[PDB]
């Protein structure tokens, strides 16, 4: 198709941001469940 200069044109490595954002969600979804345990503290929290 074309040329692989994603790094040549810019050494920002923005592409990496896609690998961290794609894997990060994996962990976040894990807290969605554990959060249930914290949802209780909401009813009564020590301010």
């Amino acid at each position: 198709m074309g040329v692989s200069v994603m790094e040549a044109i810019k050494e920002v490595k923005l592409a990496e941001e896609q690998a961290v954002k794609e894997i990060e969600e994996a962990k976040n979804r894990a807290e969605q469940i554990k959060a249930e345990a914290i949802e209780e503290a909401k009813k009564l929290i020590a301010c």
Side-chain angles (χ1 to χ4, degrees):
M1 183 66 134
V3 289
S4 63
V5 287
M6 292 174 247
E7 172 156 4
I9 302 297
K10 258 298 130 267
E11 205 206 273
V12 188
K13 293 292 209 74
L14 290 181
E16 305 283 358
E17 202 162 54
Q18 305 178 328
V20 299
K21 207 71 77 206
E22 74 177 49
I23 62 93
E24 174 64 14
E25 184 78 342
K27 206 270 270 90
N28 253 226
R29 307 254 256 192
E31 90 92 33
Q32 290 303 135
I33 302 89
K34 311 189 164 273
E36 297 169 311
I38 300 112
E39 273 202 65
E40 178 163 25
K42 280 292 215 243
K43 273 287 277 288
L44 203 166
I45 189 72
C47 181

